[PDB]
Symmetry: D3
Subunit: 322 residues, 6 copies
């Protein structure tokens, strides 16, 4: 019984955008403030059972100098400068083990896996704490409503800033070819990557699968699945805070970043996805301002194109970087 | 379709207790450190539509001087010194509105309603933030696993301390009869009250309904409901952290507090409660070291005795304070 | 999933009304027949633990002299004549205990709580039996299909008559200010109150929250929740009886009463309510012929505005009666 | 998902019986009172599309002369006196159409199908009303709690009396061999048959499949399915009425009837049945005082043996009657 | 919360049909190839407990001379040549016991019950195997995707051919009136019957209830129920095979057969049916090229009209055959 | 709210084994019959985007010469002879793409991935057909009851033979170190691997995670999840076939193979696993006749140890092979 707009409508779907007059200023100032702290990227080579890949334990300074973990996986190859995928992680995930991230290396790409602050407890473990802007306001369980009463205190202000800085950290690794740095993610990872496509000066291509954190007002109207339902549940209780909540969310909405993003991108969507509804994904894709393609999977839910989509991504990047 | 131990077994159920050798020292030090900050209780009389009750907006210093909101409701009665109920709130709730707490005042008791730090977003709104001990470690969405890797950082260290200090703040109000201060709650509120029944020197009676935060190791093995499932889900991912997690929780387990509590108590239990299973409630009741009674509701789930139990509580206190 | 018409369409939703030519005559004759039995209101003061409120055990004659229970709660105040709220109860509920109805008394209103015939066994206990018009026809479990093959035998004929008579009983209490009698309820209580707003000559204001018993034909096509599903399930079996069922229901449909009601009203609606869908609520609101306001809660289900709405009601009445 | 006692324990399961001292007196007086009214059986031959069977529209006097509907289906055969099955119907069922009951006629048996007072609205239509003992007390939706506060007013007193009288009515039809009258049913129908097996002097054999209305106290503890859950839901609300409820139910419990029943019986049971749990079925079977067999279906739920069981019944009766 | 197009749209719903240019050639060749094998119908009279009906154990040659089981039930009547219903069976069913099919015989019709190859394990037993066209390709569990990458290997090619030949077998029985041979089924049985109404030269009337195997592309878009979901799940995995899957299904789509069928038909449809959605049933009914009626059940799910529809079918055939 | 035996009982759980006298003879003959067809292993190097791994498209002869697909992935390393993992696949999966199997190659092992006959349509695509032993008997949807009425026709006879032959095919590849061939799988893959540990003379160690196809009689009594429920559903219908079904299954039960298996093994088990209940896994582990260890994950469901367990396997094999 799930259904969004028909495909012909989805392809033309361009809802009115809402953002505050200071959207750009907010992000400029946020990034400037964090850039005042040295990146201090650390890549510690590890003793590992992996044989085809060199694994490094990563640390770097993200939001306000806060130290973020990651992995760096380098495939053992003759080529001196290698292309690079900066990988962002889905909701309730974390960096896990180096072996959880063998795809891109196996395809000949260095992979920088960014750990997600405060999460890492749902489906894959993580090692990086969050650090709040002082008091942690009343919230619904999870990360979606953490600090939501003000953009400056909002959880994803910190995540997005870490994500922008992760690309700088990857770029600092000597074996990375800076002309071929890719930002990638699915769901939460895709919404992060979308922000980064607008904010980073270093990223050269975007892989954005079944993106989360897009078109919040519609998402919350359409589905009662988690994690978007964290927001709805907040609003069910804090009935006086509707305007404020959506004002805050406007600064983090992937649709508003997409409108600013200029790098080439490959999107994916599942037309039966009731976690990240197709209309939210198409809103972002349709506003995306760089060269772009989308793979559409009519019969898939939130798994999207799965391993088929991974192949499409390899082919897409090969072609782009020739 | 849910079933725990048979009632005859429940009434004898006395599982081996597990606590660390420094349980008492941990709490002594915690309370002493927070007592270095002045209580600074504030009772601001409000403009209210309420006619039978005077409503006050409360502020007091809880954990490490952190400012905690509440309500004080005083029934308009001839009697100069009135008995007092300190009310703690269930999971995902908050102090809401003064009119949400009209029972005890209508029964002739001053009511001090403690707002719950960081919550107030699920079923009733709240106004009080949490403040973490530095970094907010990776966690499962919610409050159950917030800081769980160390008792000093654990969420309920802060809440329990707030709750002890709430009794002090209530006692400071001039119309409160200090010989008749009651601590009360259901589920999370009951878990909090149980802690307070061991840690407070001011409380004179305990009302403990369908208590949560009891017998964690058993809870997690019996039910897959929330909020106990937050802990299970954390353990599913952080497979290396089992011993630490349960070590931490031993400092907050209502069964360990029950063993230390000396004041008279009225407990309630629902034999079909699959949020707070009867074996966890009985383990706390059975170890409870003060004079005690329990009302048993054989066909009820987590709603327990509802309004029938409210009557029992009114009768229990009337007799006790005679 | 759940979504009704968009808000802008809800606000203009005025479906074609269906009623029989004898609607008014049916109700005139029903009321006249019951008025031939004396009201014989009895208010027995009770021994109570309540301190701020005087409680009375109520009996009064409703449908065809049948004796209906209730509570009268009188707040202890200086004022001689007090305003009064006649409170109707949700489905499967009953008058419970006096202490279940402290809100309005606390706000300075006498509260007359009407027990619901034959129900009182789902979420709050009741003490009043139903009396059928002779044989109790085949029915689906519950009260929705009880006597549904004829308006004269239909369950809500008896309830609505009781409810009209409850206002008269409340008005007969000496401390009640007859210029300030309010009729109030949510869901079933809201549907009852809406009928009473049309049929009573004594009621001065209506509070109608998330009303049930409105726009039955649409309700049954939109949702499969209880209690509306009792009707669907009856029609699934009695496939020959569709026209008769909807003809019967037409006499009891809150939309048809709304069109006749002239007193001032405050409605509420939850846009995600799948027990009483927004389109059924708006159909009644939009046809409501008295001076009217509605509070709209976009993210709420059947809980509606909860405690926020209770505040809106106190403010609405104060302004209305000043 | 569901499991009752192991089969080896079920075979030995003989729980302590509870009944009042006046069990037999209550039923003697009940039957005597209803026998003061003339049976007045009516068998109206119908215009029917059926070719192999003669269909009759039946009326007879059941509880206190109340007129109960039925079907009589007579297979067109040479034999002058035919054996007869009196068929009782499952919960929320009714007599439906004559073609709904072609099994037994096809097997050469006259079939008397008894309509069920007040039901007939869930899965098959019915035509027979209920007639309460005056006021219809507060109840949970359905038939299980109708009049449950007193055995004199309890719904199944009426149904069981109709059912005893149905056998009388069948026996009055001239083509019926009175030496070969069988009483049959499944679930509610089985619970009714079991009562009739103890109370009727005309029945010659019992078919009792997956019987309902057995061992209530256990049923309610074991499963949360309907219809047993109507009782649990009533007890969750009316918390003061537990002793009275089970006192009443004791007069209608199939286990108490089984202990008095002397005619030959074939039972069936599904070991995965969570509507009528095996332990309640076995408690009845085990106390059953006549010659008895049971067919055990280890992998079946409430469907039991289905068409396999029907064959077992035909074989069992053939052997019994030859 | 299930709904298809509104009824007034359903009645006009005529979606664009898709079929390959060799649809007729495919079926002509398929039938001709199976007709090269002798029908070799066997009717073995059985020892049976049935008294009003003669039962025969049936064997006949279906797809490529493969031996299919069945039952023949002949009502014991004076008339020499009787009318005949060829009955096809629902998904996961089989021919069961002769006593499972007493309706039509009781109504004066010989009944030929066709067993379903490879099924017979879900709700009623079966005795007939399937015989694949060589290798059994990767498939989702069930019969819907068995051989779906090629019409020649597809499961329903074999079933439909069995079904055409079952009419021939029935016609070969000497007591069968060949002017009054009816083909009938519900759900899968209805989809089979609809194919046979196009492909058989012997059938004289169609009873088609809540037909399955219709308008596959829409079905899969609308509902996530089984068995249509078998297809969706296959497509979720085999993301490269969408075009081939629906090309294959086009040769077996009840809508494409309906457009070729010329015999008189009675359809039924449940407007809340979420197994066989109304729009798929109406697409088939609307394209049906013979004389036709539809019974519409607005409140029923996949049960459709149940026993009310059976009565309509008897009346329909009586009128047509006079 | 699921639970199997307590861990201390699980560790001692050794249920009575049931097998037929000809268990060994059945497998000797099965293997000898298939060995009469040449293995004819084909390894075709592929054009691939993979850089750290060489991919081969595999074909080999399994059951009765039937041609099975696979992948061989060889990591690019200096070492001449490499250790090898033969990987079997979970239920409804297939060989998918080479990039789906990067773990073991990345750890320095050649990986031979066996495609699963007739599956490949649920979560990962497959390319290998099944070939039945003639007719495909009536079955419940899926593979668990395919040919279950006879061990000779049973689906897993074919799968387990394929799997024994897959090890021979891997051993035939020149770079494979035959002293370091590992057999591996989870769930269905684990059940297959367990059979192979008993039947293959070439395997050197077993990795067996959360094994399926174990202790069938118990599994079916404990859980109603798929795929074990396919058997239960079959038995619900074919009520006369219980003894036959379990006799057939005894030949394929992982507990019976475990008793014969002599190679070193690492098992894993999730104590909350309700697909493969812990009692079935422990019954196999406890009868396992080779040197053995088990990793126990107390809080995990069917995911077991996930990436943690992968690490344990790499460490286990390194230690074993020194």
């Amino acid at each position: 019984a799930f259904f969004d707009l028909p495909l012909e409508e989805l392809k033309k779907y361009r809802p009115e955008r809402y953002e505050e007059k200071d959207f750009d200023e907010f992000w400029e100032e946020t990034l400037a403030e964090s850039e005042k702290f040295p990146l201090d990227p650390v890549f510690e080579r590890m003793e590992s059972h992996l044989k085809t890949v060199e694994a490094y334990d990563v640390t770097f300074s993200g939001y306000r100098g806060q130290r973020i973990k990651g992995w760096l996986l380098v495939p053992k190859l003759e080529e001196e400068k290698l292309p690079c995928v900066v990988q962002y992680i889905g909701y309730n995930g974390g960096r896990g083990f180096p072996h959880d991230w063998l795809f891109w290396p196996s395809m000949g790409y260095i992979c920088f896996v960014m750990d997600t602050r405060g999460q890492g407890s749902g489906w894959l473990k993580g090692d990086t704490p969050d650090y709040p802007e002082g008091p942690v306001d009343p919230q619904y369980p999870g990360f979606m409503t953490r600090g939501i009463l003000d953009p400056r205190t909002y959880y994803y202000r910190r995540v997005f800033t870490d994500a922008v800085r992760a690309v700088e950290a990857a770029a600092s690794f000597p074996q990375v070819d800076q002309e071929r740095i890719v930002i990638a993610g699915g769901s939460q990872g895709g919404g992060i990557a979308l922000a980064v496509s607008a904010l980073s000066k270093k990223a050269k291509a975007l892989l954005c699968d079944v993106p989360f954190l897009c078109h919040f007002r519609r998402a919350v109207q359409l589905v009662d699945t988690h994690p978007y339902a964290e927001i709805t549940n907040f609003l069910k209780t804090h009935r006086d805070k509707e305007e404020i909540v959506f004002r805050t969310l406007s600064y983090f909405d992937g649709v508003n970043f997409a409108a600013r993003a200029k790098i080439p991108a490959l999107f994916s969507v599942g037309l039966m996805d009731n976690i990240c509804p197709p209309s939210t994904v198409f809103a972002a894709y349709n506003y995306y301002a760089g060269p772009k393609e989308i793979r559409i999977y009519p019969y898939n839910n939130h798994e999207g194109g799965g391993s088929f989509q991974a192949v499409e991504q390899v082919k897409f990047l090969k072609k782009l970087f020739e």
